[PDB]
Amino acid sequence: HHPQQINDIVHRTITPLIEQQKIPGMAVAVIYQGKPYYFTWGYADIAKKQPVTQQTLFELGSVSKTFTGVLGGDAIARGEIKLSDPATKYWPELTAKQWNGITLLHLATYTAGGLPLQVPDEVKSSSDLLRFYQNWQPAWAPGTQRLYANSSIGLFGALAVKPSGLSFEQAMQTRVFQPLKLNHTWINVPPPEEKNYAWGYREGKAVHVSPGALDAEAYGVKSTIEDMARWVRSNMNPRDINDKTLQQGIQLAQSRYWQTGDMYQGLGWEMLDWPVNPDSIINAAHPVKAITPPTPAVRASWVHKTGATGGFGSYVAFIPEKELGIVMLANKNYPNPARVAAAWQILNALQ
Ligand SMILES: *P(=O)(O)OC[C@H]1O[C@@H](n2cnc3c(N)ncnc32)[C@H](O)[C@@H]1O
């Protein structure tokens, strides 16, 4: 059952969005008074006329970084890592002098001094990855500039799980996915779930994301609209979580570590004070101001993350103090401002 208020606002906003953006398939969850309401449109596979369902898997792209941030928070809560730890503590083979003074905090929050947006495609092995980072030259001193980048938080994720004894995949499954009952969320889609894996569409072609080094950490997660609704609810209400270090980790990922303009950098998540200027949630390196100690999570925030792959576009946003949130998953990568304006209209209407 849907409250009519929710059906009305979703139809008024998402139907025109799909009409304008030519999105083949889409799933939306609205979290309202903490409870989820689901909507699906169109096709997961156009050539077979296979409909989007609540079990359809979508590529999350950089929304994956929120899982990584929370897993990192959980490691912090366990005392397995500190954000002030040097990167070299967890990877002593990283001997180049430019790595002196670079911390896990820098890696997690894109402030190491200009690590590249992309890990080079030909990097395959551990020795390849080492050689990549060993020859990187910073454009800036650490902790001065934010350059949003996969190679930064991707390495954070890989290093953060070293004290656990587990692989990144094993740590994520056991410490985050399983406690939160995300049973249809995958770093690697298993064979019996391939029937539910949507195709993305780019320039008229059915596509899936390409494998790359540190993809699991930076952009590789696939999930359903139901699990993503569960993810939003968990990040809005950590107090309801039995796993103590996960509860803490979720809170730590919404701590405010850096400020640029009216945006605050968390771990994976990005935050702004609510109410927001829409200009700010719609919008190169930017200077950052450190926040020390980091501000504990502010419930009166717009918390959000966008993600894209070649064939998919994702958006998650929520306002903890209002128990209000939205997940938008689509198998076309369409412009961020269209996504965000629609989300902003919907969440404003449900206050
Ligand atoms: P977020 O969705 O902001 O970014 C992650 C997406 O960026 C693309 N990406 C990461 N790494 C590469 C490489 N090496 N080459 C081409 N594209 C890359 C993917 O679309 C990620 O999903």
PDB file of all heavy atoms in Angstrom, residues 19-36:
ATOM      1  N   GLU A  19      10.193  10.625 -19.528  1.00  0.00           N
ATOM      2  CA  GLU A  19       9.786  11.099 -20.849  1.00  0.00           C
ATOM      3  C   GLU A  19      10.870  11.962 -21.490  1.00  0.00           C
ATOM      4  O   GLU A  19      11.165  11.830 -22.678  1.00  0.00           O
ATOM      5  CB  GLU A  19       8.471  11.882 -20.756  1.00  0.00           C
ATOM      6  CG  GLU A  19       8.167  12.744 -21.986  1.00  0.00           C
ATOM      7  CD  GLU A  19       8.049  11.927 -23.270  1.00  0.00           C
ATOM      8  OE1 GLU A  19       7.636  10.747 -23.196  1.00  0.00           O
ATOM      9  OE2 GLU A  19       8.369  12.466 -24.353  1.00  0.00           O
ATOM     10  N   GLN A  20      11.472  12.833 -20.695  1.00  0.00           N
ATOM     11  CA  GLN A  20      12.462  13.765 -21.201  1.00  0.00           C
ATOM     12  C   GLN A  20      13.819  13.108 -21.442  1.00  0.00           C
ATOM     13  O   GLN A  20      14.513  13.457 -22.394  1.00  0.00           O
ATOM     14  CB  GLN A  20      12.620  14.939 -20.231  1.00  0.00           C
ATOM     15  CG  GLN A  20      11.388  15.823 -20.148  1.00  0.00           C
ATOM     16  CD  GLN A  20      11.274  16.536 -18.818  1.00  0.00           C
ATOM     17  OE1 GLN A  20      12.186  16.475 -17.985  1.00  0.00           O
ATOM     18  NE2 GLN A  20      10.144  17.217 -18.602  1.00  0.00           N
ATOM     19  N   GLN A  21      14.197  12.158 -20.587  1.00  0.00           N
ATOM     20  CA  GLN A  21      15.549  11.597 -20.634  1.00  0.00           C
ATOM     21  C   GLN A  21      15.641  10.275 -21.402  1.00  0.00           C
ATOM     22  O   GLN A  21      16.736   9.739 -21.570  1.00  0.00           O
ATOM     23  CB  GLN A  21      16.089  11.394 -19.212  1.00  0.00           C
ATOM     24  CG  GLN A  21      16.203  12.673 -18.395  1.00  0.00           C
ATOM     25  CD  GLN A  21      17.157  13.688 -19.006  1.00  0.00           C
ATOM     26  OE1 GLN A  21      18.174  13.329 -19.609  1.00  0.00           O
ATOM     27  NE2 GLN A  21      16.832  14.970 -18.851  1.00  0.00           N
ATOM     28  N   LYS A  22      14.499   9.755 -21.846  1.00  0.00           N
ATOM     29  CA  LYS A  22      14.451   8.520 -22.652  1.00  0.00           C
ATOM     30  C   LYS A  22      15.096   7.323 -21.941  1.00  0.00           C
ATOM     31  O   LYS A  22      15.799   6.513 -22.556  1.00  0.00           O
ATOM     32  CB  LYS A  22      15.125   8.735 -24.010  1.00  0.00           C
ATOM     33  CG  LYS A  22      14.652   9.994 -24.759  1.00  0.00           C
ATOM     34  CD  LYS A  22      13.141  10.018 -24.932  1.00  0.00           C
ATOM     35  CE  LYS A  22      12.680  11.302 -25.639  1.00  0.00           C
ATOM     36  NZ  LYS A  22      11.189  11.378 -25.691  1.00  0.00           N
ATOM     37  N   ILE A  23      14.840   7.222 -20.644  1.00  0.00           N
ATOM     38  CA  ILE A  23      15.371   6.149 -19.807  1.00  0.00           C
ATOM     39  C   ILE A  23      14.632   4.822 -20.046  1.00  0.00           C
ATOM     40  O   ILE A  23      13.426   4.753 -19.857  1.00  0.00           O
ATOM     41  CB  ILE A  23      15.258   6.538 -18.308  1.00  0.00           C
ATOM     42  CG1 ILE A  23      16.153   7.751 -17.996  1.00  0.00           C
ATOM     43  CG2 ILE A  23      15.620   5.346 -17.407  1.00  0.00           C
ATOM     44  CD1 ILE A  23      15.755   8.528 -16.739  1.00  0.00           C
ATOM     45  N   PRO A  24      15.357   3.759 -20.453  1.00  0.00           N
ATOM     46  CA  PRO A  24      14.695   2.482 -20.770  1.00  0.00           C
ATOM     47  C   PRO A  24      14.067   1.815 -19.548  1.00  0.00           C
ATOM     48  O   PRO A  24      12.937   1.318 -19.608  1.00  0.00           O
ATOM     49  CB  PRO A  24      15.836   1.619 -21.329  1.00  0.00           C
ATOM     50  CG  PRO A  24      16.875   2.597 -21.762  1.00  0.00           C
ATOM     51  CD  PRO A  24      16.789   3.726 -20.772  1.00  0.00           C
ATOM     52  N   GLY A  25      14.780   1.818 -18.431  1.00  0.00           N
ATOM     53  CA  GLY A  25      14.269   1.158 -17.245  1.00  0.00           C
ATOM     54  C   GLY A  25      14.678   1.923 -16.007  1.00  0.00           C
ATOM     55  O   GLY A  25      15.783   2.463 -15.938  1.00  0.00           O
ATOM     56  N   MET A  26      13.792   1.957 -15.022  1.00  0.00           N
ATOM     57  CA  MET A  26      14.053   2.736 -13.812  1.00  0.00           C
ATOM     58  C   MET A  26      13.357   2.157 -12.594  1.00  0.00           C
ATOM     59  O   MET A  26      12.255   1.622 -12.691  1.00  0.00           O
ATOM     60  CB  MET A  26      13.611   4.192 -14.020  1.00  0.00           C
ATOM     61  CG  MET A  26      13.984   5.130 -12.885  1.00  0.00           C
ATOM     62  SD  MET A  26      14.084   6.837 -13.482  1.00  0.00           S
ATOM     63  CE  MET A  26      14.790   7.628 -12.034  1.00  0.00           C
ATOM     64  N   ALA A  27      14.020   2.261 -11.445  1.00  0.00           N
ATOM     65  CA  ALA A  27      13.429   1.866 -10.178  1.00  0.00           C
ATOM     66  C   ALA A  27      13.661   2.978  -9.161  1.00  0.00           C
ATOM     67  O   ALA A  27      14.735   3.584  -9.119  1.00  0.00           O
ATOM     68  CB  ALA A  27      14.015   0.514  -9.682  1.00  0.00           C
ATOM     69  N   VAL A  28      12.632   3.286  -8.381  1.00  0.00           N
ATOM     70  CA  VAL A  28      12.721   4.344  -7.381  1.00  0.00           C
ATOM     71  C   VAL A  28      12.186   3.843  -6.056  1.00  0.00           C
ATOM     72  O   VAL A  28      11.156   3.155  -6.002  1.00  0.00           O
ATOM     73  CB  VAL A  28      11.922   5.609  -7.788  1.00  0.00           C
ATOM     74  CG1 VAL A  28      11.766   6.571  -6.598  1.00  0.00           C
ATOM     75  CG2 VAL A  28      12.594   6.328  -8.959  1.00  0.00           C
ATOM     76  N   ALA A  29      12.888   4.173  -4.982  1.00  0.00           N
ATOM     77  CA  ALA A  29      12.342   3.930  -3.653  1.00  0.00           C
ATOM     78  C   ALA A  29      12.214   5.265  -2.961  1.00  0.00           C
ATOM     79  O   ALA A  29      13.146   6.066  -2.976  1.00  0.00           O
ATOM     80  CB  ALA A  29      13.223   2.980  -2.846  1.00  0.00           C
ATOM     81  N   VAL A  30      11.054   5.513  -2.366  1.00  0.00           N
ATOM     82  CA  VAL A  30      10.901   6.648  -1.478  1.00  0.00           C
ATOM     83  C   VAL A  30      10.807   6.115  -0.060  1.00  0.00           C
ATOM     84  O   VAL A  30      10.029   5.191   0.209  1.00  0.00           O
ATOM     85  CB  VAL A  30       9.653   7.495  -1.809  1.00  0.00           C
ATOM     86  CG1 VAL A  30       9.499   8.604  -0.785  1.00  0.00           C
ATOM     87  CG2 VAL A  30       9.768   8.076  -3.211  1.00  0.00           C
ATOM     88  N   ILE A  31      11.642   6.655   0.821  1.00  0.00           N
ATOM     89  CA  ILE A  31      11.577   6.331   2.241  1.00  0.00           C
ATOM     90  C   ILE A  31      10.818   7.457   2.911  1.00  0.00           C
ATOM     91  O   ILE A  31      11.224   8.618   2.847  1.00  0.00           O
ATOM     92  CB  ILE A  31      12.974   6.181   2.898  1.00  0.00           C
ATOM     93  CG1 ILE A  31      13.861   5.209   2.112  1.00  0.00           C
ATOM     94  CG2 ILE A  31      12.835   5.739   4.349  1.00  0.00           C
ATOM     95  CD1 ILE A  31      13.300   3.855   2.005  1.00  0.00           C
ATOM     96  N   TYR A  32       9.695   7.117   3.531  1.00  0.00           N
ATOM     97  CA  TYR A  32       8.806   8.129   4.078  1.00  0.00           C
ATOM     98  C   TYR A  32       8.384   7.691   5.464  1.00  0.00           C
ATOM     99  O   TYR A  32       7.865   6.587   5.624  1.00  0.00           O
ATOM    100  CB  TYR A  32       7.601   8.312   3.166  1.00  0.00           C
ATOM    101  CG  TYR A  32       6.569   9.283   3.676  1.00  0.00           C
ATOM    102  CD1 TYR A  32       6.822  10.647   3.689  1.00  0.00           C
ATOM    103  CD2 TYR A  32       5.333   8.833   4.123  1.00  0.00           C
ATOM    104  CE1 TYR A  32       5.876  11.539   4.142  1.00  0.00           C
ATOM    105  CE2 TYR A  32       4.379   9.719   4.579  1.00  0.00           C
ATOM    106  CZ  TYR A  32       4.655  11.067   4.588  1.00  0.00           C
ATOM    107  OH  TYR A  32       3.705  11.951   5.042  1.00  0.00           O
ATOM    108  N   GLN A  33       8.633   8.556   6.446  1.00  0.00           N
ATOM    109  CA  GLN A  33       8.497   8.202   7.857  1.00  0.00           C
ATOM    110  C   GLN A  33       9.218   6.872   8.121  1.00  0.00           C
ATOM    111  O   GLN A  33       8.699   5.981   8.794  1.00  0.00           O
ATOM    112  CB  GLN A  33       7.017   8.149   8.253  1.00  0.00           C
ATOM    113  CG  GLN A  33       6.344   9.518   8.147  1.00  0.00           C
ATOM    114  CD  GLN A  33       4.835   9.467   8.342  1.00  0.00           C
ATOM    115  OE1 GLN A  33       4.281   8.449   8.759  1.00  0.00           O
ATOM    116  NE2 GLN A  33       4.163  10.571   8.030  1.00  0.00           N
ATOM    117  N   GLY A  34      10.415   6.750   7.548  1.00  0.00           N
ATOM    118  CA  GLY A  34      11.252   5.583   7.746  1.00  0.00           C
ATOM    119  C   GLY A  34      10.872   4.298   7.024  1.00  0.00           C
ATOM    120  O   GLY A  34      11.601   3.311   7.141  1.00  0.00           O
ATOM    121  N   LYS A  35       9.758   4.295   6.287  1.00  0.00           N
ATOM    122  CA  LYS A  35       9.284   3.089   5.589  1.00  0.00           C
ATOM    123  C   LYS A  35       9.398   3.219   4.056  1.00  0.00           C
ATOM    124  O   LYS A  35       9.233   4.311   3.523  1.00  0.00           O
ATOM    125  CB  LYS A  35       7.837   2.792   5.983  1.00  0.00           C
ATOM    126  CG  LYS A  35       7.693   2.383   7.451  1.00  0.00           C
ATOM    127  CD  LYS A  35       6.252   2.459   7.929  1.00  0.00           C
ATOM    128  CE  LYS A  35       5.345   1.499   7.175  1.00  0.00           C
ATOM    129  NZ  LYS A  35       3.941   1.594   7.672  1.00  0.00           N
ATOM    130  N   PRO A  36       9.678   2.102   3.355  1.00  0.00           N
ATOM    131  CA  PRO A  36       9.970   2.183   1.914  1.00  0.00           C
ATOM    132  C   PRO A  36       8.759   1.969   1.010  1.00  0.00           C
ATOM    133  O   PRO A  36       7.903   1.115   1.278  1.00  0.00           O
ATOM    134  CB  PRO A  36      10.981   1.055   1.711  1.00  0.00           C
ATOM    135  CG  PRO A  36      10.504  -0.004   2.683  1.00  0.00           C
ATOM    136  CD  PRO A  36       9.939   0.749   3.887  1.00  0.00           C
TER     137      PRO A  36
END
